[PDB]
């Protein structure tokens, strides 16, 4: 009735919301990994050359920080892909037996696939996060390998 339907559509709703946050957060650690690609590039041709001292320590707090969001990233996008999925089924049980129809079903259908392609694309953009922290890591490890022989 259009209770459930109401209903279909403020959780397509609750899901964009979620996205959009998401969003935010992913911008913002992948600026933080460009600032950090930078930073470490100065150290390492600084070193082809206790100010340095102080600049690693800041860049390897800098980068677990980084990797922590990462990490709260990777766990929310499970959550928001599984809150997809359960909208699926929903919304898939009403049309399997038609009680949404007009255009109401093509819009939530186009609605479907729009939260998932976004979500897909989230899920990439987060790869490229990860793909980035872990090159970081490497780098900033081989600079501590230096400065512990040296």
């Known amino acids: ?29 992948v600026s933080k990994i460009k600032q950090l690609q930078a930073r470490i590039l100065a150290v390492e041709r600084y070193l082809k050359d206790d100010k340095l001292y102080r600049e690693v320590a800041l860049i390897r707090a800098q980068l677990q920080k980084i990797e922590s969001e990462t990490l709260q990233l990777l766990h929310q996008q499970a959550e928001i892909e599984r809150e997809l999925n359960n909208q699926e089924q929903e919304i898939g049980s009403l049309k399997q037996r038609g009680l949404i129809d007009g255009p109401l079903l093509s819009g939530i259908d186009q609605q479907q696939n729009n939260l998932k392609r976004a979500i897909e694309a989230q899920k990439h953009l987060l790869q490229l996060t990860v793909w980035g922290i872990k090159q970081l890591q490497a780098r900033i490890l081989t600079v501590e390998r230096y400065l512990k022989d040296q």
């Open 1 to 29: 009735a259009r209770q459930e339907l109401s209903g279909i559509v403020q959780k397509q709703n609750n899901l964009l919301r979620q996205i959009e946050a998401q969003q935010h957060l992913l911008q913002l650690t």
